Amino acid sequence: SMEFPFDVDALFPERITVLDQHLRPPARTPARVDLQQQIMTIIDELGKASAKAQNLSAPITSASRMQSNRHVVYILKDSSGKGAIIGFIKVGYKKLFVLDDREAHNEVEPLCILDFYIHESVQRHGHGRELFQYMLQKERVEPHQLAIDRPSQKLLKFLNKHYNLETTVPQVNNFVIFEGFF
Ligand SMILES: CC(C)(COP(=O)(O)OP(=O)(O)OC[C@H]1O[C@@H](n2cnc3c(N)ncnc32)[C@H](O)[C@@H]1OP(=O)(O)O)[C@@H](O)C(=O)NCCC(=O)NCCS
């Protein structure tokens, strides 16, 4: 997994840390601003890593952009010194126009899966599921109520395997939604 020039276990005492625009250092140290800089560095690097893996020319996730856009990120640390980071999922509500099965446009504002990444060295070990499930439970949203931003084939296979999400409603934007969404 991905390691950092500082102590991740101390920064993130919980296995899954939930952060929003205020980037609050979790309850216990270095000064608060220094801990926030650590968190920024982690999000910046997670976003970079997710970006390469997706053939992205630019990351969709960074510390500054998460703050400005008021997204929420769930970061999973490694349980296997100084700790390391396994991956993350980034979510947010977006106002969308979405097509239904009747090819009719609909104004909706669902919870969106905006970025999702698990370190390559530890994929297909069930970490993505654990993280996704945690997010669902915290957000109080059902999987079929989600919109997915530009999913990979991997993520589509994932959503089928773990949540029986298979049948999609064809869109012209770059979001995917499932039967059940409406
Ligand atoms: C998508 C991702 C978050 C899944 O997390 P994960 O920790 O690998 O997932 P889990 O181990 O909980 O679930 C594994 C399931 O995901 C799917 N999956 C994961 N890696 C896969 C691969 N290389 N090929 C095909 N399916 C894959 C499969 O359904 C797999 O089940 P299987 O092993 O029974 O085939 C992770 O693979 C990833 O980071 N991918 C790279 C970037 C990306 O595409 N994600 C962003 C979506 S746009």
UniProtKB/Swiss-Prot annotation:
Phylogenetic lineage: Eukaryota, Metazoa, Chordata, Craniata, Vertebrata
Modified residues (N6-acetyllysine): 52, 138
Record-listed acetyl-CoA binding positions: 116-129, 152-161
Part of the full-length chain shown: 1 to 190 of 421
Stated consequence of mutating residue 100 to A: Reduced activity
Residues the record marks as site: Crucial for catalytic activity: 54
Organism annotation: Homo sapiens
Effect on the protein upon substituting residue 98 to A: Reduced activity
Gene: ATAT1
Domain N-acetyltransferase: 2-182
Identification of the protein by name: Alpha-tubulin N-acetyltransferase 1
Domain of life assignment: Eukaryota
